[PDB]
Design a protein around this motif. Structure first.
Motif, short mmCIF file in Angstrom:
data_model
loop_
_atom_site.label_atom_id
_atom_site.label_comp_id
_atom_site.label_asym_id
_atom_site.label_seq_id
_atom_site.Cartn_x
_atom_site.Cartn_y
_atom_site.Cartn_z
N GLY A 27 0.78 -1.22 0.00
CA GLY A 27 0.00 0.00 0.00
C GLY A 27 0.81 1.27 0.00
N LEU A 28 0.14 2.37 -0.34
CA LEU A 28 0.73 3.70 -0.38
C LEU A 28 0.21 4.47 0.85
CD1 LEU A 28 -0.20 4.43 -4.10
CD2 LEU A 28 2.04 3.60 -3.26
N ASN A 29 0.72 5.68 1.08
CA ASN A 29 0.27 6.50 2.21
C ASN A 29 -1.07 7.13 1.86
OD1 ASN A 29 3.20 8.00 3.87
ND2 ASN A 29 2.69 5.88 3.38
N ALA A 30 -1.95 7.21 2.86
CA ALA A 30 -3.26 7.82 2.68
C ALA A 30 -3.41 8.86 3.78
CB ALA A 30 -4.35 6.76 2.78
N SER A 31 -4.36 9.77 3.63
CA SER A 31 -4.57 10.81 4.64
C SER A 31 -4.69 10.16 6.01
CB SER A 31 -5.83 11.62 4.32
OG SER A 31 -6.99 10.84 4.49
N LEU A 50 2.71 10.95 -4.33
CA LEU A 50 3.38 12.14 -3.84
C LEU A 50 3.48 12.17 -2.32
CD1 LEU A 50 1.96 14.88 -6.19
CD2 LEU A 50 4.34 14.07 -6.04
N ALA A 51 2.41 11.72 -1.64
CA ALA A 51 2.40 11.72 -0.18
C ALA A 51 3.33 10.66 0.37
CB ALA A 51 0.97 11.49 0.33
N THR A 52 3.38 9.51 -0.30
CA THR A 52 4.25 8.42 0.12
C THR A 52 5.71 8.86 -0.03
OG1 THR A 52 2.65 6.77 -0.71
CG2 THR A 52 4.87 5.98 -0.25
N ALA A 53 6.02 9.46 -1.17
CA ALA A 53 7.38 9.92 -1.44
C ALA A 53 7.87 10.85 -0.34
CB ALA A 53 7.43 10.63 -2.79
N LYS A 54 7.01 11.76 0.09
CA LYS A 54 7.36 12.73 1.12
C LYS A 54 7.83 12.10 2.44
CE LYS A 54 5.74 17.43 2.06
NZ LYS A 54 4.59 18.36 2.08
N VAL A 55 7.04 11.18 2.97
CA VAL A 55 7.39 10.52 4.22
C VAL A 55 8.60 9.61 4.07
CG1 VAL A 55 6.61 8.94 6.01
CG2 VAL A 55 5.02 10.59 5.01
N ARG A 83 11.41 10.48 2.22
CA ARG A 83 12.56 11.28 1.82
C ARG A 83 13.01 10.94 0.39
NH1 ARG A 83 14.28 12.29 7.34
NH2 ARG A 83 16.44 12.92 6.90
N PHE A 84 12.04 10.89 -0.52
CA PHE A 84 12.31 10.63 -1.93
C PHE A 84 12.01 11.97 -2.59
CE2 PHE A 84 10.71 9.33 -6.22
CZ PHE A 84 11.89 8.75 -6.70
N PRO A 85 13.00 12.57 -3.25
CA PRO A 85 12.82 13.87 -3.91
C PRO A 85 11.47 14.01 -4.62
CG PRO A 85 15.07 13.17 -4.14
CD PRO A 85 14.29 11.97 -3.63
N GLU A 86 10.69 15.00 -4.21
CA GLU A 86 9.38 15.23 -4.80
C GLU A 86 9.45 15.63 -6.27
OE1 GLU A 86 6.81 18.67 -3.72
OE2 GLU A 86 5.37 17.11 -3.10
N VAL A 87 10.56 16.27 -6.65
CA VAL A 87 10.74 16.68 -8.04
C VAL A 87 10.90 15.42 -8.90
CG1 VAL A 87 13.26 16.86 -7.77
CG2 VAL A 87 12.12 18.07 -9.63
N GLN A 88 11.39 14.33 -8.30
CA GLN A 88 11.56 13.07 -9.02
C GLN A 88 10.25 12.29 -9.15
OE1 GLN A 88 15.04 10.66 -7.82
NE2 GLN A 88 16.02 12.59 -7.26
N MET A 89 9.39 12.37 -8.15
CA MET A 89 8.11 11.68 -8.22
C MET A 89 7.30 12.33 -9.33
SD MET A 89 6.59 8.94 -6.51
CE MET A 89 5.98 9.24 -8.30
N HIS A 90 7.29 13.66 -9.35
CA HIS A 90 6.55 14.37 -10.39
C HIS A 90 7.04 13.93 -11.76
CE1 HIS A 90 5.22 17.49 -7.39
NE2 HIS A 90 4.15 17.43 -8.17
N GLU A 91 8.36 13.82 -11.91
CA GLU A 91 8.94 13.42 -13.18
C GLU A 91 8.38 12.07 -13.59
OE1 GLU A 91 13.19 11.98 -13.90
OE2 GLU A 91 13.38 14.06 -14.61
N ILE A 92 8.39 11.12 -12.67
CA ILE A 92 7.87 9.79 -12.95
C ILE A 92 6.43 9.88 -13.43
CG2 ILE A 92 7.39 7.50 -12.11
CD1 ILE A 92 10.15 7.84 -11.52
N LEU A 93 5.63 10.65 -12.71
CA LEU A 93 4.22 10.83 -13.01
C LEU A 93 3.97 11.45 -14.37
CD1 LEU A 93 3.40 12.13 -9.45
CD2 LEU A 93 2.26 10.13 -10.40
#
Ligand SMILES: Nc1ncnc2c1ncn2[C@@H]1O[C@H](COP(=O)(O)OP(=O)(O)O)[C@@H](O)[C@H]1O
Ligand SMILES: [Mg+2]
Length: 415
Positions: free
Chosen positions: A333-337, A353-358, A360-370
């Motif tokens: 599973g991923l992170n949920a509210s 995006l929320a999972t990446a944050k908790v 410590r995975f660069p948010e600029v990289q998650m966006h790129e993937i998306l």
């Protein structure tokens, strides 16, 4: 009584089954002193003396087919002293995933389209891992629950490896799983994901999937075939296959990501692993548990993420047996509210995006993937369809892309 452990041509140590039934392992002093020594598993670090933790029983158990029924087939195929790993491995432990060879370098036999068919249909007669009775020097072992076998392909011929000679392809038989996986692999590759190459093989009236192994490598001149040390997440954490799913106590995204920080290729591996989560989500893969991710154990004990594999879409199986898209859950599973997010039909970009944050995975990289999936999905699905043999099952193709495009829409509206 005692199984010696080798890695290609070097003795690593020995596995012994004690009087009290426990499995113990001792590294060879020579191996410990060797040039670029490495552990059999990160749960069994190099050390002198007998290792007796449950990490030993579990490590080897994890080399064996998951199904209790296949193990049954094995115990009867070679009259194993018992159903315990040691005894089953004494019979089929010459060739297994990674570079572990157990016995208490290049020879084989070429197969005719008549014998090949036999092997590929042996299970029909309760034969384990297609190890037909006709032979007796064909001892292999592969994990997973899906019916399969392993063979050596020298040139354009399929062969049965002899002695301690290695195999080069895992072959999956029809338990529409064959066409499905083939499709997801080509789709995985079309999007630039690191996955093995596969080819559908036809022997008579049999359709099987031949996947190239990434735990085998030929030398430059193609004269010697070597095995590459490798282990799945369960082994790496010293856990039993019984708990491979996060819901059963197995490792989830967070634990793997933390683990990957120790990778000799940490940033990239962490990147590729998150990118794979988004992929599994897009194609409705619900079986991305712990044995479906592995790492190479390199010289000195360093490790790195292997290519992805065992990719199957649940989409083509929807409807036919009452399975609704609402029942598809990611294995991790991923992170949920609040808590976690597991339903594929309810998952959106915000969850990654929320999972990446908790983590410590660069948010600029998650966006790129998306965003990279956003624009690349349509064409990728297109390009793949055109590379499909005319004899490929259409329902599989329709269900997959219809359902992907559906999910994909969630990305294109955002990026
Ligand atoms: N291309 C490959 N190269 C090396 N090992 C592989 C490859 N594909 C799968 N494996 C290994 O073999 C096991 C079984 O294959 P998998 O495709 O996962 O089976 P099922 O589909 O039986 O779960 C995996 O857990 C992994 O250890
Ligand atoms: Mg598996």
């Amino acid at each position: 009584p005692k199984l010696v452990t080798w890695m290609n041509n070097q003795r690593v140590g020995e596995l012994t089954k004690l009087a009290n039934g426990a499995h113990t392992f001792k590294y060879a002093p020579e191996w410990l002193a060797s040039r670029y020594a490495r552990p059999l598993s990160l749960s069994l670090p190099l050390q002198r003396g007998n290792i007796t933790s449950d990490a030993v029983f579990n490590f080897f158990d994890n080399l064996l087919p998951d199904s209790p029924i296949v193990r049954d087939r094995i115990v009867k195929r070679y009259h194993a002293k018992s159903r315990q790993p040691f005894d089953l491995l004494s019979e089929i432990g010459r060739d297994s995933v990674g570079a572990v060879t157990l016995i208490p370098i290049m020879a084989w036999e070429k197969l005719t389209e008549a014998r090949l068919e036999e092997v590929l249909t042996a299970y029909k007669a309760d034969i384990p891992l297609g190890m037909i009775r006709e032979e007796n020097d064909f001892r292999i072992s592969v994990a997973g629950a899906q019916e399969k076998t392993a063979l050596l392909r020298i040139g354009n011929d399929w062969c049965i490896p002899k002695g301690i000679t290695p195999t080069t392809h895992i072959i999956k038989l029809p338990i529409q799983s064959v066409d499905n996986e083939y499709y997801c692999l080509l789709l995985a590759k079309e999007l630039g994901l690191n996955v093995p190459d596969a080819e559908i093989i036809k022997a008579g009236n049999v359709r099987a999937l031949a996947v190239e192994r990434f735990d085998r490598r030929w030398n430059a001149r193609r004269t010697v075939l070597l095995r590459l040390p490798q282990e799945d997440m369960c082994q790496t954490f010293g856990l039993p296959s019984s708990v491979k799913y996060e819901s059963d106590g197995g490792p989830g995204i967070a634990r793997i990501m933390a683990f990957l920080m120790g990778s000799s290729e940490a940033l990239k591996d962490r990147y590729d692993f998150m990118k794979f989560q988004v992929f599994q989500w897009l194609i409705g893969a619900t079986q991305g548990h712990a044995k479906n991710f592995s790492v190479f154990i390199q010289a000195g004990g360093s490790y790195r993420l292997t290519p992805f594999y065992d990719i199957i879409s649940a989409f083509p199986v929807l409807g036919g047996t009452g399975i609704h898209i609402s029942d598809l859950k990611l294995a991790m599973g991923l992170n949920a509210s609040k808590g976690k997010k597991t339903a594929i039909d309810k998952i959106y970009p915000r969850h990654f995006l929320a999972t990446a944050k908790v983590l410590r995975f660069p948010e600029v990289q998650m966006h790129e993937i998306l965003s990279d999936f956003a624009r690349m999905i349509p064409a990728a699905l297109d390009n793949v369809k055109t590379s499909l043999p005319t004899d490929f099952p259409e329902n599989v193709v329709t269900a997959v892309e219809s359902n992907v495009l559906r999910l994909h829409g969630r990305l294109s509206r955002e990026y």
